[PDB]
Amino acid sequence: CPLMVKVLDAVRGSPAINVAVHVFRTAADDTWEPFASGKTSESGELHGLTTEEEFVEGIYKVEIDTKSYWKALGISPFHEHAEVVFTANDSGPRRYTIAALLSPYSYSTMAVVTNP
Amino acid sequence: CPLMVKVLDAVRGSPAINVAVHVFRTAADDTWEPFASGKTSESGELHGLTTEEEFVEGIYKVEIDTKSYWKALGISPFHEHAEVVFTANDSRRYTIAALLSPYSYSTMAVVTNP
Amino acid sequence: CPLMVKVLDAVRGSPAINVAVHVFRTAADDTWEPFASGKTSESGELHGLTTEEEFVEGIYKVEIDTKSYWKALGISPFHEHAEVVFTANDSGPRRYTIAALLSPYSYSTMAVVTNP
Amino acid sequence: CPLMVKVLDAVRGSPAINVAVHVFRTAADDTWEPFASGKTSESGELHGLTTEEEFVEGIYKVEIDTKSYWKALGISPFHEHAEVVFTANDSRRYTIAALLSPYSYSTMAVVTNP
């Protein structure tokens, strides 16, 4: 898969399960248009968001819905969500893994980009 | 100073100097509208963005212009910018820090009571 | 495997390949004794360090040799290595994944602990 | 102040207060020996560990006693402590920061010239 999202919970030391993820792409009029969405699995991973055909060059935003995640665990966190905004596929198709490590008042995000 | 932003560079072990930072507030039509902006100083900090009177409860976004910072250094980065989106709550000082690398960033909020 | 180490390079956006990892365990005289070692693969992962039988309760240190990694890429980094020190298996056997995200003047480390 | 240590708590969004910090230097027999120590202040910082005269080039270790910090808050942590090992080089001020969570930490070094 050309786009995978992995989310981990730094309070529990576990995958962050059932985290909602929304992906948008910038349109020709420079607005964000819905591109794909899903929820992380028991492994903290979200696969199957898109295909190589559909994932053309563009500016993408991966929105990870961290506030809803934390609230369900009894934590009122600082952020509304974690946002990851990047140009994709501007040098040809790549595979992207976006990882996010979550705490209530912090997060870290890292991308691994590979050429298939 | 109810809101301060600090940006650090994890490639060079330094403050991230002259980084543009833009703050937005959510308007009634649920759109983002410009609220304040500036560039980080030689210590990587940006003070004086807003005042207590102006910084009312609401949802804000801080957008740190990391791509241009890395381009100026000749380093290829992943992200267009870093985004920190949060609600201000009167329930008193917010420090938003961001630690920047070319393909990763970490952001932390310190919320303290004067 | 009960102990796995994963290392990523935040400058390149890639797995950190051929990173040396040394694991130690505290001995009865409170000194660090060699426990296992290896190098990360092309995926940034190091498997096969130990077995469930050998990985008894104890205090362990995973030493990730980050300075040698960076120097080979032309970077003189800040740290000598990244150290991860933890009690393991004190509530019965667990599986541990230790991840480290590396930059020249920073690193992040996260553990995922699961019960098999 | 050639060496400062700052510790932050990512669960509460605050400085990490009253955290014990121990600094070691490598001795000639390649063993670690105590060099300096203290506890972080209400701002999460620890100043005054050493002096310019004393902080000569060499390999140092900073060990932040995170387990006891989390135990006092009633939170189960992963690590015994956080360790930052580095060489001091005369090639001038070191700030070591650590952002703490129960199963993760991030550490950053800012090296600046006065």
Author numbering:
A (entry chain A), C (entry chain A): 10 to 125
B (entry chain B), D (entry chain B): 10 to 100, 103 to 125
Describing publication, verbatim:
To test this, the dimer–dimer interface was stabilized with the well-characterized T119M mutation by generating the double mutants R34G/T119M- and K35T/T119M-TTRs. We took profit of the fact that R34G/T119M- and K35T/T119M-TTR double mutants do not aggregate significantly at acidic pH to solve their crystal structures at pH 5.5 at 1.5 and 1.4 Å resolutions, respectively. As expected, no major structural differences between the pathogenic mutants and T119M-TTR were observed, with overall Root Mean Square Deviation (RMSD) values for the Cα of 0.24 Å for R34G/T119M-TTR and 0.15 Å for K35T/T119M-TTR. On the other hand, in good agreement with the molecular simulations, the BC-loop regions (residues 36–40) were remarkably affected in the double mutants, in one or both asymmetrical chains. Indeed, putty-style cartoon representations based on mean Cα β-factors show much greater values in these regions, pointing them as the most dynamic in K35T/T119M and R34G/T119M TTR. The contact region at the tetrameric interface of double mutants, which consists of hydrophobic interactions between the AB- (residues 18–28) and the GH loop (residues 105–122), was preserved. The presence of Met119 keeps all those interaction residues virtually at the same positions, which allow the formation of key contacts in the presence of the second amyloidogenic mutation. Gdm.HCl-induced equilibrium denaturation revealed that the double mutants exhibited lower stabilities relative to T119M-TTR, all displaying a single transition, with midpoints Cm= 4.3 M for T119M, Cm = 2.6 M for R34G/T119M, and Cm = 3.2 M for K35T/T119M. Although the crystallographic structures of the double mutant variants were very similar to that of T119M-TTR at the same pH, greater flexibility of the BC-loop (higher Cα β-factors) was observed in the presence of the K35T and, especially, the R34G mutations. Overall, the crystallographic data suggest that BC-loop fluctuations constitute the triggering mechanism for R34G and R35T tetramer dissociation and subsequent aggregation.
